[PDB]
Write a protein that binds this ligand. Sequence first.
Ligand SMILES: [Ca+2]
Lengths: 44, 55, 743, 331, 333
Amino acid sequence: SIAQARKLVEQLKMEANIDRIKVSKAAADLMAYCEAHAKEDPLL
Amino acid sequence: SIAQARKLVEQLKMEANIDRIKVSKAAADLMAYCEAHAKEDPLLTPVPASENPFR
Amino acid sequence: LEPPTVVETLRRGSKFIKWDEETSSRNLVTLRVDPNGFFLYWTGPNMEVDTLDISSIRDTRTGRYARLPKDPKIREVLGFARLEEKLMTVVSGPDPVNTVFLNFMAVQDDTAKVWSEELFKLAMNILAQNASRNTFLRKAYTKLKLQVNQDGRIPVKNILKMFSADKKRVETALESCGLKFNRSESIRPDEFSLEIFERFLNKLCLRPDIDKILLEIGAKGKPYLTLEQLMDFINQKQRDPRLNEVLYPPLRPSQARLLIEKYEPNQQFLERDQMSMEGFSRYLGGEENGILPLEALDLSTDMTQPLSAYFINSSHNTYLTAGQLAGTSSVEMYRQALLWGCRCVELDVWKGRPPEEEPFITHGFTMTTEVPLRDVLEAIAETAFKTSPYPVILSFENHVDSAKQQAKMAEYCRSIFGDALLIEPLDKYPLAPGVPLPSPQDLMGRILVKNKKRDEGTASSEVNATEEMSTLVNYIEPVKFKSFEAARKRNKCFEMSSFVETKAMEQLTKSPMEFVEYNKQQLSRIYPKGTRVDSSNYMPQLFWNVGCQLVALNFQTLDVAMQLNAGVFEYNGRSGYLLKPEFMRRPDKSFDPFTEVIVDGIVANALRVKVISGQFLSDRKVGIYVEVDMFGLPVDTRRKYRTRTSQGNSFNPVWDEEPFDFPKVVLPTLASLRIAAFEEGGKFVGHRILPVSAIRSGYHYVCLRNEANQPLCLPALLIYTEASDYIPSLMDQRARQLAALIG
Amino acid sequence: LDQLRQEAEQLKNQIRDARKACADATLSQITNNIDPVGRIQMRTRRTLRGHLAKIYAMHWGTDSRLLVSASQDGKLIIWDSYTTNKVHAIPLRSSWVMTCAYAPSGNYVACGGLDNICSIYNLVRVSRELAGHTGYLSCCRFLDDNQIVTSSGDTTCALWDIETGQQTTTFTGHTGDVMSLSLAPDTRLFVSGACDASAKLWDVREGMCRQTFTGHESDINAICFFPNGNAFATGSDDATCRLFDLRADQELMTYSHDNIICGITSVSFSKSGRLLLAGYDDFNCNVWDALKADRAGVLAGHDNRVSCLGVTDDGMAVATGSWDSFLKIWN
Amino acid sequence: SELDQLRQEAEQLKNQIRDARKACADATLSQITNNIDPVGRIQMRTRRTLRGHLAKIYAMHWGTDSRLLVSASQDGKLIIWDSYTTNKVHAIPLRSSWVMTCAYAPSGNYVACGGLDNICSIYNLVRVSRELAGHTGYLSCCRFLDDNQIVTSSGDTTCALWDIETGQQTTTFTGHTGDVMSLSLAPDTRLFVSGACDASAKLWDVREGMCRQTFTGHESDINAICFFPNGNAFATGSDDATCRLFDLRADQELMTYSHDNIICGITSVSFSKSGRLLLAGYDDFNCNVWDALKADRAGVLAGHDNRVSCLGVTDDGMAVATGSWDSFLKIWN
Ligand SMILES: [Ca+2]
């Protein structure tokens, strides 16, 4: 039963070594996506 | 009661010591019969209308 | 109570010569009964399998009771010494007046006593009359599988006839499930299986009435309930909350695991304790989710109380089959009455002829057709105890004047009835002033005689009895009604006094409390006036609400009054005896019946019937509207409720509107619901009359009957009841109340 | 009674492994090296009007000219298939007939029915009145001038002697109704089909049930005997014909098909034994092959249920009796 | 002493996960898109009503050329519709009656199926061309990569990528606990996410068969998912009646589309062409189109009577088809 939990330890240890992308550039890129295609949208 | 079950075994008793022949010969006895009689059977091949009594 | 079981000598078959006196044509067919216990099918005269709905069988009389052939062409063919033990006639039909005969004749010895005993056991079985909804769809699938054509396949002209609201769906719904969908083609009976017919009915109709339930119980996105979401669906929404929960235990998570393993089709849901959407559309018309429980349908009432404290099903001039003036009297009408559940019949014995002196039956001074008396008592003693072993009260209108006809009709009853005619008083209850009447238990299997001891129509010109006819009158006895204070002071509880409908409305409203105070000791029958010459009926609820016992109707014309007196006597095991509620049979605590307020001593209920929808309601594309009556005490009677008519869109309409409330019913063990569904245009479809203290709450299928309480196969409703306890110029004072009840 | 159950059934599994030891090659394997008969079509040559109700049974003569029929009117009629002249007209005294027969001499024609009594007519009036069945009679066939084998509904058969009228031997051993029987062309043995799905093979010499055959799952309605004497073909209510042998002790073919559901009523063989003419319940008579298990033509000619057949000893034609009072002779 | 000493570290780094979000907690879209004007009042109309089904529609999928749409129903009848001329081009029956999904191909000559019978049956454009068995739960949603490989999502808490020439579970994915109700692909098909039943949104990398990112946030079921068209964000449905918008770069939920008088939960989510709109379905039979960067209702698409079961714009964003439970698959514009 511990081997189910020992999969989770190797599941969460790879969540530590992920590059942090902050929301300043990221959410503004989602802002920039809706503006770069703002006239190619037949439901507005 | 018991006697109908007694004779049920005794009728089945003579069914044990019966003899047989193989189905390869049993399907050869039938297959000899049809082809030796297919020349005159009036239902495989029809007959002339003169000898035919129903026409 | 047993489920309908087919014995081995009915599944395999026997060989029966079916004859008919009309066309004088007899074949040689082999009768069978399909293993569910539904139909009586035989391969026909031109190789087309006929049927007969086995719930539409009223009696199967054999032997000396059967119908003998009268034509010497048929008589010389069948062979007419002791061979009138192989006959069998199976009467059928919806009403008592309309009966068809199926004159069989067996070809082996002693196979007709076995059959006709085991067909009457299958026609009068409770759990195949109050059955499930899913049982009433296997009764409409077996009808489709039996009636094959000559080739032996199911014709598509039968599937386009049974579900025939719009045939543009059935031609589409057959073509999408993988069968032959043309107008003249055939489906083979082993590629038309119950798994396929179930898949046929899902494609046929669209069901938002079920899907509205599946949003309130929490099934949101996953196609399965849990065990927990079902275990508190029953104990929260579909549990009758009048009842004591210590004796009626709520549902356990080990008990609800069987409800999954009985209905759920998929295997990946069965092992995980989860029920799919098709498992819940199967459960709602299962054998546990019924509109009534099986404690109020079998013979479970306190049968120890005396005979003054019971509703006794009764009749008035029950020998007639038409209007009261120019009709035709019969003798078959007694057999259809005493089999239905009647327990008091009427006989108008009139003086016979001067050629030979023997009495007979006819209506006085109307030149109606006459039936002889000797063949009436043989049609009474035969069938008095074939459905209910509880006593029958004969009620003579003795009109003869000769002395020799009086003794001759006295010798008939002591000969035809045998030992079942109560000629002596019992040991425990002798006829002295101050005693009570016997119970139905201690009179079980006996037959009493009502006659004089030693706008009325014809019952006012009655003759003084003689010393021979007066020997049979023992317990129930007529005496001319003088007053109330003379009756209570005398205190002989073996007297009765008949009242017409008029003179008992002059004594229902003038003094109702003394009427109930008298109706706990003694009897009083009620029979309608002579000005209803078309044989219509007054409401019996006018005179049960003061506790009369033998309220008598006309059994021939089935209007809403006679559709009541055979829907309120279907309970207590169809025995024709119902116990009066507690404060109408107790000598200490009396009450006014006309009370606009609740009474201290009776708990009051409240009801909210919501009529959601209903499937397969009609043969033609037309709208349906539902009336929800509720009879009772005059402060309970509401007859104004009705839905709006639907559009006739498909097989099932949907009504989406407010529920019908009944807030304060003072006496709820006397009240009774009624849910009639009409066609748009007054044409009847069905009705079901339920009692009030026994009806469950929650989402149920009410499976409609016809106008004489025989089950219909396809139509039903999906209603939602909600019962709970209640948490709070004298004539015109009372005549303005009964006008909701008289109509 | 405990010991009797197992030692009887232990021999009943001694049959199956002895049957499995014999079943080396079923008959469909050997006949593949022979071409089929292809298509064969018969037409209605004569038609026999004069009956008034449903027709139940028929049996050609050994002189191969006449026949007989037994209607529900109780009107036994002897036809002539050459000129369509009713040669006699014999009225019964019990209109519930169920079978008839014909003698090899041509002089005696028997007919019995639901009235349990096998009357025998002379060629006119009854000569012998054979009674003793406590159930309904279902089929009877003549052996010779003096002996007739009947098949009642009291789960028996019989072997009479009509000069005395007494039963010589009661061929008992069935557990349900006995539906039909068929003698042998050498007239030494016969078969019997029941409502227990139990064909058999008896013998007229000793009186014993010699062999026993099972295999169907419904009633058995009619059985014919092969013109070799080696085989016999049965017909059941499960819309199948089968073909056994007295030596192989097992079914050898199974003449079934899809879109054939309703039961069977009467079978027979041809003169050689090549065909197997069955008469079904969906009003058509089929022609199978005794070796190929393929159809070869349908006799779609009747308007009600076809209830009896019979093929002449000269093999000229067949005849089908139906429920609409018609006898169609097909050649 | 061993089963406790892992739980001290099984929740140690998880607390570093949320504390990494606090270091990344810089702004939301309410404080960075507040100077953006809305789109106004959005009205649509029933352009074409595709009658032709017999029972509840349970899924649909658009084609590649924005013309053909498939629609599997509960009666077991795939119909490949033509939106331009209101045509039933094919009508493929099924051997699996209880359906809950359907698909189409990017090249456009293959269809899929699925449902309660645990089998995904690829057809050809009509005969049964393939079969995919091996799931021990109900099939719920299946999508296509190309003509050779197909992903599914099942009721046995496992997603599975298949091969269409062999018919076996080539790559199998594990890690959820409840059922797996829907999945969707990124527009590059390099990484696909799926939403479970027990309130999680996990991302599976297709090239390796092992997760790399796990989202949380819901308190109930998840019944739909769909991608933002640039492939760096996605959005889900729920049972708690709130859609979301997650950031695959920033690992954090960004915006909730919550509103009062909204008690029915979502059953279908799909974005629009330029990513300004988020459409949705509900149990009030409407189809509330939400503006993305303002978290606000902007239009009601109310043309049904029973609940909405599937929804989706085209590959150019011209039309939008909602398939309800009344067999009436509309097209809005
Ligand atoms: Ca009268």
